[PDB]
């Protein structure tokens, strides 16, 4: 008869926040904020939120709580031809889950290796270090060479990732069994948090979403107590208003607030589906996003205080110590800074645990949206048991992550995250933004909000959904397609054909949306105007 609901408002109120907050909030925002105007990056970061991010977040969050349908069945009630979107996202998810979990696997392997009294990445007398390995608490006067490496860089590169055993994308096999066991434990800890439905995913989030703020607080007062930490904050907040003249940093801010907010994917749709009909949507979206940004903001300090201390211990120019913009900023730089602090075991355990709890909530929701849609599209054909479907998804993602668990797995992570998944999620998000605003009608949407909340949404939001948001996504998509960034990772430049592979994976994700449009266009009898009329008008 009817579907389930939430156990408490706070459970989903923290579930959506837990999905929104992840690793990128911690480390992607501080770097891009430091190199694009410093504190002045705060100005375009908010403008792209109020006009781009918040309208998509709220508009996405409203439809779910109004229609109470999955990512697939909701299109049958809006624009059946666009039902392929609900499938596209599914395929998209299969790609996303192929790498997003492996990162956590790395953190887990770093956590289980942090139970030793002497942390592995402090000394160089290990079984994986080379002759270039030079650590501290060693002879003074040491001078760095073009070939010299640090015990942290050696530990990440040659032990956990083991990327020295592959020559690139061409030859990357085989699979590392350690990270396979790690990602199995992770795929097990997400199973028991989803298999029961929204009951456990609203209860497990209590831990996964609150721990990172505590850990960030400890790391904050720690990095604030470190000598010479003001340099990282200065480099973090130094206004460079000339960056605002470049048309690039605005696109960077737009993309950053889009992926951090994460609209258009059906996760917010599914989370909103299980909720009260008369429940407020405005305040929910507002609070959650503003926290997601604030959390990024304080995370900036959490990183740059420690990196400032690292620049003080070395010789300044935080850009030099923060050259690498990736996991290496956390797994090498930040970790090496942790190793040189008292109670290093503590600050390592809580750090990697923080990473894992940062990732878990987003993977809970990440799967939750797809599971919800599929069950809603194939009801009671499906839903006979939930644990069965959730297990069938988790295992598929595990076999889908074996390509990422290889020695040259990080390369595939970059390729899929930047050349494949990204432009496809932006594309399908653009398709949704166009469909809801220009097909279903923005006036009827404001009428639905007027039904739930009791009042029609303001003109400020209507004018955003009509024009501001679709142009907001269009600008980012066009900016990427016009000039895809040259990929580089660990002194290795990607081949020229990488963009061909990424686009191949990207297009293969939404091959379902136009072919489904052709499907319904080929299924409905009569004239094409009557078929597109039964395809544009919701089900009678």
């Amino acid at each position: 008869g009817e579907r389930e609901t939430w156990g408490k408002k706070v459970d989903f109120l923290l579930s959506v926040i837990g999905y929104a907050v992840d690793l990128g909030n911690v480390w992607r925002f501080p770097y891009i904020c430091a190199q694009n105007g410093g504190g002045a990056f705060l100005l375009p970061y908010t403008i792209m939120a109020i006009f781009g991010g918040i309208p998509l977040f709220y508009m996405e969050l409203a439809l779910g709580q109004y229609h109470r349908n999955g990512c697939i069945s909701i299109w049958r009630k809006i624009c059946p031809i666009f039902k392929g979107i609900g499938y596209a996202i599914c395929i998209i998810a299969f790609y996303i889950a192929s790498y997003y979990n492996t990162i956590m696997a790395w953190a887990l392997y770093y956590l289980i290796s942090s139970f030793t009294d002497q942390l592995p990445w402090t000394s160089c007398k290990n079984s994986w270090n080379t002759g270039n390995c030079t650590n501290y608490f060693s002879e003074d006067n040491i001078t760095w060479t073009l070939h010299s490496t640090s015990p942290a860089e050696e530990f990440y590169t040659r032990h956990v990732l083991q990327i020295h055993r592959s020559k690139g994308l061409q030859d990357l096999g085989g699979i590392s069994w350690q990270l396979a066991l790690c990602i199995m434990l992770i795929f097990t800890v997400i199973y028991f948090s989803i298999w029961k439905g929204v009951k456990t995913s609203g209860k497990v989030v209590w831990v996964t979403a609150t721990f990172p703020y505590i850990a960030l607080s400890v790391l904050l007062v720690r990095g604030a107590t470190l000598p010479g930490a003001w340099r990282g904050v200065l480099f973090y907040l130094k206004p460079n208003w000339q960056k605002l003249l470049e048309t690039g940093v605005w696109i960077d801010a737009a993309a950053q607030i889009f992926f951090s907010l994460g609209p258009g994917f059906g996760v917010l749709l599914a989370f909103a589906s299980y909720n009260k009909f008369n429940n407020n949507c405005y305040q929910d979206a507002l609070v959650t996003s503003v926290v997601n940004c604030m959390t990024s903001f304080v995370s900036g300090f959490v990183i740059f205080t420690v990196l400032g201390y690292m620049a003080e211990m070395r010789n300044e120019d935080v850009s030099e110590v923060a050259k690498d913009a990736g996991p290496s900023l956390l797994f090498i730089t930040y970790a090496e800074a942790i190793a040189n602090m008292p109670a290093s075991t503590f600050f390592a355990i809580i750090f990697f645990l923080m990473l894992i709890t940062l990732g878990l909530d987003s993977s809970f929701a990440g799967l939750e949206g797809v599971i919800t849609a599929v069950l809603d599209e194939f009801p009671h054909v499906w839903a006979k048991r939930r644990e069965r479907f959730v297990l069938a998804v988790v295992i598929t993602c595990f076999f889908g992550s074996l390509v990422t668990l290889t020695f040259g797995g990080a390369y595939v992570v970059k390729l899929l995250e930047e050349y494949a998944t990204g432009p496809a999620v932006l594309t399908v998000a653009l398709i949704e933004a166009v469909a809801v605003s220009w097909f279903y009608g923005i006036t009827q949407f404001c009428r639905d909000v007027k039904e739930m909340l009791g009042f029609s949404p303001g003109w400020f939001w209507r004018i955003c959904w009509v024009a501001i948001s679709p142009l907001f996504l269009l600008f980012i998509i066009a900016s990427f397609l016009m000039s895809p960034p040259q990929l580089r990772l660990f002194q290795y430049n990607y081949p020229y054909w990488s963009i061909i592979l990424g686009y191949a994976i990207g297009t293969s994700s939404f091959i379902c949306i136009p072919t489904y449009i052709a499907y319904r266009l080929i299924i409905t009898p009569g004239t094409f105007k009557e078929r597109i009329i039964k395809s544009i008008t919701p089900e009678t």
Partner: antibody, heavy 119, light 108 residues
């Protein structure tokens, strides 16, 4: 016996180009950044840019972007700097100096190259 | 960028006196200052690195001190062959800049 032997003096007409060499010896050539410092007559030193010999990893100065081009040859352990669009301001003494990654000091310098840009 | 300012373009000293050259930077530098010696007609020669540390092959009479923006290069016993132009240079932020240069003239 770390020695950096540059090329001789060059007299070139304004608007032309000039290439200066830098033969290195006495150390592992693939271990250190190779730099080029411009010193004007009676002025101070002015860092032009470095280059990574392993892959040719150049790093120029914003003041010299598009003015100097650094190359390197591992087969003979020799660095090169080319200057185009020569004017009267380019008539100065140029050095090529070895430098580690950190701390970035200039331990060994070349003998210098007196460049005269005049017709 | 960084502006390494040497206020004293010329300094006079005698054989055996204690001479100290100052170097003023734009921002805070911590301990990233190098002192080079360039004799008239020769290439610059590295003397001090990282504020105080001496390089290999440098007499003990050349010292260095300072931590922040103002730095000092000190010579205890000035010799006749110590006649050269001294330069200070920051080595933290890109690009690496130099000082104006202090031509040390000997008084007799």
């Amino acid at each position: 016996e770390v020695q950096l032997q540059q090329s001789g003096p060059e007299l070139v007409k304004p608007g032309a180009s000039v290439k200066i060499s830098c033969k290195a010896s006495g150390y592992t050539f693939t271990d250190y950044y190779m730099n080029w410092v411009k010193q004007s007559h009676g002025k101070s030193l002015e860092w032009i840019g470095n280059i990574n010999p392993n892959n040719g990893g150049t790093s120029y100065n914003q003041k010299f972007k598009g003015k100097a081009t650094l190359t390197v040859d591992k087969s003979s352990t020799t660095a090169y700097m080319e200057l185009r669009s020569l004017t009267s301001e380019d008539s100065a003494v140029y050095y090529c100096t070895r430098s580690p990654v950190r701390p970035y000091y200039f331990d060994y310098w070349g003998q210098g190259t007196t460049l005269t840009v005049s017709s | 960028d960084i502006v390494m300012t040497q206020s004293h373009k010329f300094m006079s000293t005698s054989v055996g006196d204690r001479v100290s050259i100052t170097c003023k930077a734009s921002q805070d530098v911590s301990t990233a200052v190098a002192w080079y010696q360039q004799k008239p007609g020769q290439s610059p020669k590295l003397l001090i690195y990282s504020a105080s540390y001496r390089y290999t092959g440098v007499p003990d009479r050349f010292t260095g001190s300072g931590s922040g923006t103002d730095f000092t290069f000190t010579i205890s016993s000035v010799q006749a062959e110590d006649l050269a132009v001294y330069y200070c240079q920051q080595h933290y932020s890109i690009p690496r800049t130099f000082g104006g240069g202090t031509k040390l003239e000997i008084k007799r």
